[PDB]
Amino acid sequence: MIIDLSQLPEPEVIENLDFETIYQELLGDFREAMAGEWTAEVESDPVLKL
Amino acid sequence: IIDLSQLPEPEVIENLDFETIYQELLGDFREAMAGEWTAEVESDPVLKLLQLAAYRELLLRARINDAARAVMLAYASGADLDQIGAGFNVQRLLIRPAQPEAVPPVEAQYESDKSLRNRIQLAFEQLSVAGPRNAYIAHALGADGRVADASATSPAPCEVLISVLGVEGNGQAPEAVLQAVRLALNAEDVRPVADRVTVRSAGIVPYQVKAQLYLFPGPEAELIRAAAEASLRDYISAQRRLGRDIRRSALFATLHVEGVQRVELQEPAADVVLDETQAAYCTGYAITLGG
Amino acid sequence: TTCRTADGDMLDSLCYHVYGHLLGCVEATLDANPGLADEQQPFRAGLLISFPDMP
Amino acid sequence: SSRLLPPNRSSLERSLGDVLPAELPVPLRELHDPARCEAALLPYLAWTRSVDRWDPDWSDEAKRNAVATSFVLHQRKGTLTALRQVVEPIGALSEVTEWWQRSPTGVPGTFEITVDVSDRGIDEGTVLELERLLDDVRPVSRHLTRLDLRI
Amino acid sequence: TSKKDAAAAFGIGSSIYLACEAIYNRAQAVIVAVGVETAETPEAQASA
Amino acid sequence: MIGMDRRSGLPLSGLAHLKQSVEDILTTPLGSRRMRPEYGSKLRRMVDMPVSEGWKSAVQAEVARSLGRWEPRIGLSAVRVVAVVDGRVDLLLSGVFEG
Amino acid sequence: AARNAPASAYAAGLFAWTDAEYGFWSSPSNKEIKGVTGTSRPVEFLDGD
């Protein structure tokens, strides 16, 4: 009497990922860390390369 | 059957602090920029990038560790043992499931933690149907209104003495609940072997404890006194879960909470012995303060 | 829809030509591929990436 | 790395592409292979495989085979084959008893076994463990506490 | 043609890699390097 | 807007930040950026195309496109092909200064 | 630490850089050397003397 694997709930450690919810955090971790000394959110600025 | 999820945490990757990660990145950076490093190069925007990068693998050494907890049965949380128990033939069952007697008060309930993991621990003790020491144990934990089992044999061979203990209240388990183990052990035992089923195989002696604790002059003595029984009233029910002994030191360490400088014990003159056969029951406690 | 890479191809460049956008389309490719992330980001000459449908 | 960055890049950005990612090993698949676990976290895996008896004195070649073959030992407890492999660190397989070697219908006790173990590598001690090391393989009432040994 | 090409062809820490290190930081140009073995006396190094 | 210099990390806002963004755009190809396949220029793909009067209509478009997309603080004046020497095409790009 | 370089390879770094930046008709005689951190026997050039 084995249980089929297709009726299990989804686990905790598997995460749907997003590039944006990592990259928009890195904006919101660097902008507050500069204290307004960096304010060029244009993509050609070489902070958005890195 | 001992819970492994009550230990200090194991580190599969080392967990460095923020400062030695930063200087480890700077050293690699100097080697890469060798021949080009200048005082102007280490500017304020560049340094604040490196202070981010020292923090991101501070959250990745914390990511590998927090992932490796929930893979091992040591410190795995809910909705994640279903992936581990499927590897050990463990499916959660229904203990009075969601029957809506009335439709707005929904009453849904599953098996909780720290006992479903125990079944996973006993998963490999359910493979052998030739009856080792634990297969009589690990099949008798299919019921709910009991506690775990212990096996012994004093008489002539193929006479199994199993002690079906049960935690539901004051001692004696009902004989109608005793008949359920033969419904759980029919095609799991060996056929020539024959067991006798004794619920209380040695006897019950009444025990107590009387402790005169001290608290500090300071915070409130209502929630600190009551916090001692939060680690004690679930501890006494876990003693016959392994069938093993209680000590004098069990009556000390389960009463040390935040705000304790010394404790004291008077109820035993000397410690008693409780073997795998011998067990006892605790009737009623009274832990107050001396101050 | 399994495709074969080359030895210098990269993941976000490949699935932009296939899908047309990259919002939610790269990490879904790493999700439905066993051991792709373990492999180095500059892919080897003959690895197989199975691109899923409905990104 | 440097290649990941666009072709037009300074030598400052080319250095930061090797530093700002800062990749790490993920030693997660090695946690469930007993032949590839580290020695510091090996008794975590010995718990979930229900390894009943364990010693912190063996060599690492003698510790990993006790975890890897913990499935086969508990799968067929009654069979002789598991008994052969439960004595793994003590290299010993000489002789096993059976009914018809004794003529008067077995011993009183319905033929509890007196197995043979031969150890030449270690001579000091090694006796007081063997009456309880074989206790988990032994059923509760199919065998009696009679035992034989050999050094 | 590059800073890594001088480290592989003459070794890091050589006296001629340190000269290519001086060039590839300011500029990026083609270097036709010869490279000689270290003579014993400093007077015989000039003859090499 | 205040940004950092590409080499040497120095914070410069007006003069070289407007120059390190335009001069990078003309030689950065499309798809070289990570998760941004539309940043860059087609000027790296304009190499070895035949120099016709329809080719200058594309380069004056791609200068007006790739700078019109990702550099709004630059007003393009004129992209005049002024010399064809040895296959080398001299395109003069005089840009206005803002800020 | 700070070692003494022959300062001849650092001058050829400027002859190769000005030909790529300003052209082969441009003298490298005002351009900056990047890797240095000093100069043995420092020479005097104050403003206009």
Q: Do D11 and F7 touch (CB under 8 A)?
A: yes
CB of C11 within 8 A of CB of C53? no
| Residue B68 with chain A: CB contacts under 8 Å | none
**Do the two chains F and A touch, given a threshold of 8 Å on CB pairs and at least 3 pairs?**
yes
Query: Two tokens at D21?
Result: 């990612």
- State the count of interchain CB pairs (< 8 A) between A and B: 40
Cα Rg of chain G, angstroms:
13
CB D1 within 8 A of CB D17: yes
Q: Are D117 and D92 in contact (CB under 8 A)?
A: yes
List, as one string, the DSSP characters of B5-73. Answer: TTSPPP-SS----HHHHHHHHHHHHHHHTTTT--TTTS-HHHHHHHHHHHHHTHHHHHHHHHHHHTTSS
Place of tokens 């150890």: D119
Enter the tokens of residue B188.
Answer: 């799991």
> Positive or negative CA dihedral for F40, F45, F47, F49?
negative
Nearest to G20 among E18, E20, E27 (CB): E27
Residues 6+ apart with CB under 8 A from G46: none
Task: Judge contact between F9 and D12, C-beta under 8 A.
Answer: yes
Neighbours of B26 (CB within 10 A): 15
- Chains C and B touching, counted as 3 or more CB pairs less than 8 Å apart: no
Method for structure elucidation: cryo-EM
Q: Do chains F and E touch (3 or more CB pairs under 8 A)?
A: no
d(CA B178, CA B198): 9
Element spanning G16, H or E: helix G9-21
Please give the structure tokens belonging to residue D138: 């032994």
The β-bridge relationship of strands B210-213 and B286-289 is parallel
Entry resolution (Å): 3.5
Written as six digits, the tokens of C19 are: 């899908």
Residue F30: what are its φ and ψ, rounded to 5°?
-80, 140
| D124: phi then psi, degrees, rounded to nearest 5 | -80, 130
Q: Give Cα B57 to chain centroid, integer Å.
A: 32
**Which position has the token pair 């793909």?**
F45
- Torsion, CA C37, CA C40, CA C42, CA C48, rounded to 10: -60
Instruction: Name the residue with tokens 């902008």.
Output: A31
Chain-chain contact of F31 with C22 (C-beta, under 8 angstroms): no
- The answer to whether A46 contacts chain D (CB < 8 Å) is yes
Distance CA(B184)–CA(B143), nearest Å, equals 8
C partners (3+ CB pairs within 8 A) are A, F
Query: What's the half-sphere exposure (Cβ side, CA atoms, 13 Å) at B266?
Result: 7
Contact between A46 and F4 using a beta-carbon 8 Å cutoff: yes
CA distance A41 to chain F (A): 8
CB contact under 8 A, F2 and A39: yes
Distances (CA, A) of B160 to B98, B149, G43: 40, 13, 102
Q: For residue D17, list chain A residues with Cβ-Cβ distance below 8 A.
A: 50
> E strand or H helix at F83, and its extent?
strand F76-84
Nearest to B1 by CA among B119, B107, B108: B119
Q: Report the alpha-carbon distance of residue A27 to residue A24 in Å, rounded.
A: 5
- For an interface test with B, which of A1, A7, A13, A50 has the most B Cβ atoms less than 10 Å from its Cβ? A13
- CA–CA dist B181, E29 (Å, integer): 87
Question: Residue B224 corresponds to which tokens in the numbers above?
Answer: 């600190």
Neighbours of F78 (CB within 10 A): 11
A11 interfacial to chain B (CB closer than 8 Å): yes
